[PDB]
């Protein structure tokens, strides 16, 4: 189906102690493939997926220089933003940046994005047309006016609509055995009696890729929400994901409840029932 | 690959 490449950048100021901590990661869909950590000893962009190992040394030289240039800009932004909000020099603050591109099932351009956050709140973001900006407050309006006069949206649009889509297609081809292979969830249910009249039914979904999935509980066919607990999708650690949904049902009425699992790797939706 | 060096805020 659809696909996406995304890059994440985080810079945390450590005033008085040195340069900001800088961490950068790259994702194709739900798979990380590159990383950089300013506290690592290599001081280089590093691979994190097997299909990116096919890139020559000039790839890693280019990505290392560009990723360090990102950290230099964030280093100055932390100082600039500190002055925009009249903050003190002794406090720690965080800059976050995310951008990338989505493609459809035909691998043609679908949308691009470029977003920026200060201290975990929206600061400025590129709009859908990739030609204008959304400023979240007065301090960001100064950035918006600066970035509009410099026409930096033209440069980003050329990357998001061109370079970004071209390399996403290349990665999907070089990693077709992993990025294009779907992993259906392996499901099972557990039963635990919390008393002599109620029981907990937990519907499990393990070892699936990609991470998108929906678990819904139904009683006699109608949806259920009360006494239903749903946990966030979590990484298993091997490239696949896990998720479970639980419900507290009366004893002797377990056969009235059904768990419905929907995932790309499933030809038809799964239906789970305890007896 | 990622984008080139960004403009400062």
């Amino acid at each position: 189906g659809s696909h996406s490449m995304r890059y994440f950048f985080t810079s945390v100021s450590r005033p008085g102690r040195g340069e900001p901590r800088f961490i950068a990661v790259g994702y194709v869909d739900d798979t990380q493939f590159v990383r950089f950590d300013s506290d690592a000893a290599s001081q280089r962009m590093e691979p994190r997926a097997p299909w990116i190992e096919q890139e020559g040394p000039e790839y890693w030289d280019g990505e290392t220089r560009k990723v360090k240039a990102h950290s230099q800009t964030h280093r100055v932004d932390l100082g600039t933003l500190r002055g925009y909000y009249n903050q003190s020099e002794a406090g720690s603050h965080t800059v976050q940046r995310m951008y990338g591109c989505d493609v459809g099932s035909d691998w043609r351009f679908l949308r691009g994005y470029h977003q920026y956050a200060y201290d975990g709140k929206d600061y400025i973001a590129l709009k859908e047309d990739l030609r204008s900006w959304t400023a979240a407050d007065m301090a960001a309006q100064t950035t918006k006016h600066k970035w509009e006069a410099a026409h930096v949206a033209e440069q980003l649009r050329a990357y998001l609509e061109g370079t970004c889509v071209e390399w996403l297609r290349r990665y999907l081809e070089n990693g077709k055995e992993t990025l294009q292979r779907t992993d259906a969830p392996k499901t099972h249910m557990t039963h635990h009696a919390v008393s002599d009249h109620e029981a907990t039914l937990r519907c499990w979904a393990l070892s699936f890729y990609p991470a998108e999935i929906t678990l819904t509980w139904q009683r006699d066919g109608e949806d259920q929400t009360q006494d239903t607990e749903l946990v966030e999708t979590r990484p298993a650690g091997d490239g696949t994901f896990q998720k479970w949904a639980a419900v507290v049902v009366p004893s002797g009425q377990e056969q009235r409840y059904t768990c419905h699992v929907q995932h790309e790797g499933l030809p038809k939706p799964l239906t789970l029932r305890w007896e | 690959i990622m984008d080139q060096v960004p403009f400062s805020v």
């Epitope: 000039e58 280019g62 360090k68 006069a149 410099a150 050329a158 | 060096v5 403009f7």
Partner: T-cell receptor, first 113, second 112 residues
Framework: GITQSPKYLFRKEGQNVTLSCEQN?????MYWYRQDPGQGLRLIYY???????QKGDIAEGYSVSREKKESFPLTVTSAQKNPTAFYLC?????????????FGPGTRLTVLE | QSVSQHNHHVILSEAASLELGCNYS??????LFWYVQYPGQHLQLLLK??????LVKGIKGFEAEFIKSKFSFNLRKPSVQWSDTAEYFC???????????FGKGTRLSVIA
């Protein structure tokens, strides 16, 4: 736009001279070039952003600083033994390939004894 | 990285065709520029390849052709003028956080 030291200037032996270069274009990147007759433009120093500068191909004998965003002063020390040279300052929005460089008028520096 | 302008000095009569070669040694994607330095004036951008059409129109009837396979960005003008007498610089940027690289330049003399 970009302004730099007067179109002409001279120095004496054993003396250091600082060439100023300023821009109100809100540009992050600034550059210093030396234009030699048969060699074209030769990069001395470039500054990707404030507080950051890197050596060019002929950085020997020169020093720079970037304590402010607007200014990129080039200092020609006495170790630089060229009797005459033409220095160009430039700036761009960023170091990105999409941003062209705007150039100052230039400066002729002569050794006058 | 280097940029090669093969003609060091070109002397042309008026209304003749101009063809200034430019080649670069970098092997990835690039952006390309042509600068002109008229006598007594500073360097100013003549044209640039941003994206899209490899045939790039410029000011004063100039046109350049970006050929990815030949790593060339030759500058052309069908009918030169006397006012075209200047120095012409080719410039290429390699998109890896490295500064723009200029060629050695080509001096154009247009016989009045």
């Amino acid at each position: 736009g970009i302004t730099q030291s007067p179109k002409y200037l001279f120095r004496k032996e054993g003396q250091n001279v600082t060439l100023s270069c300023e821009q109100n274009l809100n540009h992050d990147a600034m550059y210093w070039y030396r234009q030699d007759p048969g060699q074209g433009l030769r990069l001395i120093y470039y500054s990707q952003i404030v507080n950051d500068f890197q050596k060019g191909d002929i950085a020997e004998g020169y020093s720079v600083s970037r304590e402010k965003k607007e200014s990129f002063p080039l200092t020609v020390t006495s170790a630089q033994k060229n009797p005459t040279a033409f220095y160009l300052c430039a700036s761009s929005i960023t170091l990105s390939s999409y941003n062209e460089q705007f150039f100052g008028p230039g400066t002729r520096l002569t050794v006058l004894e | 990285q280097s940029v090669s302008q093969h003609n060091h000095h070109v002397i042309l009569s008026e209304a003749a065709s101009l063809e200034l070669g430019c080649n670069y040694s970098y092997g990835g994607t690039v952006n390309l520029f042509w600068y002109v330095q008229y006598p007594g004036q500073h360097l100013q951008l003549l044209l640039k390849y941003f994206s899209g059409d490899p045939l790039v129109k410029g000011i004063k009837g100039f046109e350049a052709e970006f050929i990815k396979s030949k790593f060339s960005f030759n500058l052309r003008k069908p009918s030169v003028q006397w006012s075209d007498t200047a120095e012409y610089f080719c410039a290429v940027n390699a998109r890896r956080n490295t500064p723009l690289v200029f060629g050695k330049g080509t001096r154009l003399s247009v016989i009045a």
